[PDB]
Design a protein around this ligand. Structure first.
Ligand SMILES: O=C(O)C1=C[C@@H](OP(=O)(O)O)[C@@H](O)[C@H](O)C1
Ligand SMILES: O=C(O)C[NH2+]CP(=O)(O)O
Length: 445
């Protein structure tokens, strides 16, 4: 069922910790490793529930996955080698695994069924099912193009040129993965850049995939279908979204000095850091380097006084999953923090705009929720914030609502309670232990 947790004011967070692996890259490591020819070896994999579900889906289609020591070793089936799954592919809470896998196997000439939990089952799949219909996939979905969904690919899929209508890396990725088993050239046009793990990793696995960027920023990504993919050695960098929790906690809790090691610094993932620096955050980027083909660095974070800023709609894609924690940081900043271009938040694990606004109000924060925006006015000393009565923030099965408000409780005058901590393990099973090690006091029911 549900397991509430309460965060209490901290006298200071301090230490050096390695953050768990990046979820996006981890999902793709299991997918590409499972599809490629030969062996793939992965170090640093995030072992949260979302990623484990993608792994089980790949095994269901023929890939052999095992963990030897600290390395996940995968024996892939080779491009075009996926086998028809016996039962529905259960993605639990993970749309990344669900949506990318719909593109990956939907173009195969067999039936595949997709299911998930109460949260995933309410999320929109039309954004990926429409391009798949264009490629010739037959779709059976619940009203509104929601799960459960059953796909049946054509004998010969049709390659398309698809302009992604919203800033979704998952839609871009689903079309590219469908292209892997489609003869001809699949093209995805992305008017606004989104995380590029699919492009980078597929190139690393040997795909004839190219990215061309116009001076106006529009990206044209071309993929030649049915080409060989070769298993690779993958070193997964630290998750920058997970990093956000101890990083923001250290900025807000007085007397803090926290260093997070091996953090992914791809700029499509660092909008929150840039925003916090604009707010006056003391975040030092240490030893920027190349590791596993990605940009990484260690981040030293110290207590800072913050001032509200206006965050432009075009930075949104580079920090879309960090709006919840940014809203909590804004609750302690001087003045108003204004964030627009937030329509995508309404279709995540929870409607995040509604969940964040409601959670902030329950904890005494002055904020204004708009259809696609949020304004937060802060109280730097934290006085009057939190909830003395112990009322619980509704998490709506969303791991980041749970984590963001638990961080808030380490700073506010009154404790902050979340109605459920059980979904935190979908992306950051180490959260409680990691925060406790730094000094945070979080009581699980
Ligand atoms: O492709 C990916 O790895 C992801 C893309 C994003 O979703 P959208 O494509 O829906 O924006 C992000 O929020 C999710 O956690 C992972
Ligand atoms: O991790 C996040 O904050 C949002 N996306 C989760 P997914 O789309 O994979 O379910």
């Amino acid at each position: 069922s549900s397991r509430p947790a309460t965060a209490r004011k901290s006298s200071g967070l301090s230490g050096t910790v390695r953050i768990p692996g990046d979820k996006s890259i981890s999902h793709r490591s299991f997918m590409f490793g499972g599809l490629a020819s030969g062996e793939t070896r992965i170090t640093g994999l995030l072992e949260g529930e979302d990623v484990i579900n993608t792994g089980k889906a790949m095994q269901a289609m023929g890939a052999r996955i095992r963990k030897e020591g600290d390395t996940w070793i995968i024996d892939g089936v080779g491009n075009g080698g996926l086998l028809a799954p016996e039962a529905p592919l259960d993605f639990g809470n993970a749309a990344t695994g669900c949506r990318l896998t719909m593109g990956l196997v939907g173009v195969y000439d067999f039936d595949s069924t997709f299911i998930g939990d109460a949260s995933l089952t309410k999320r929109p799949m039309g954004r990926v099912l429409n391009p798949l219909r264009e490629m010739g996939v037959q779709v059976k979905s619940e009203d509104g193009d929601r799960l459960p969904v059953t796909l049946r690919g054509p004998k010969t899929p049709t390659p398309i040129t698809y302009r992604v209508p919203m800033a979704s890396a998952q839609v871009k990725s689903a079309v590219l993965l469908a292209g892997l088993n489609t003869p001809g050239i699949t093209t995805v046009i992305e008017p606004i850049m989104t995380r590029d793990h699919t492009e980078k990793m597929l190139q690393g696995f040997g795909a004839n995939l190219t990215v061309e960027t116009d001076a106006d920023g529009v990206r044209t990504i071309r993929l030649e279908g049915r080409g060989k993919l070769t298993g690779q050695v993958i070193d997964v960098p630290g998750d920058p979204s997970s990093t956000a929790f101890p990083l923001v906690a250290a900025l807000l809790v007085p007397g803090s000095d926290v260093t997070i090691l091996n953090v992914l610094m791809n700029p499509t993932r660092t909008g929150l850091i840039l925003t916090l620096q604009e707010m006056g955050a003391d975040i030092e980027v240490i030893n920027p380097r190349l590791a596993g083909g990605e940009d990484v660095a260690d981040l030293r974070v110290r207590s800072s006084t913050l001032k509200g800023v206006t965050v432009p709609e075009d930075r949104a894609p580079s920090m879309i999953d960090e709006y919840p924690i940014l809203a909590v940081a804004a609750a302690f900043a001087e003045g108003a923090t204004v964030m627009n271009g937030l329509e995508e938040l309404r279709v995540k694990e929870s409607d995040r705009l509604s969940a964040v606004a409601n959670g902030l109000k329950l904890n005494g924060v002055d904020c204004d929720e708009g259809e696609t925006s949020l304004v937060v006015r802060g109280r730097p000393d934290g006085k009057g914030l939190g909830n003395a009565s112990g009322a619980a923030v509704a998490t709506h099965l969303d791991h980041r609502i749970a984590m963001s408000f638990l961080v808030m409780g380490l700073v506010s005058e009154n404790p902050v309670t979340v109605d459920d901590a059980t979904m935190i393990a979908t992306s950051f099973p180490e959260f409680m232990d990691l925060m406790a090690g730094l000094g945070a006091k979080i009581e699980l029911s």
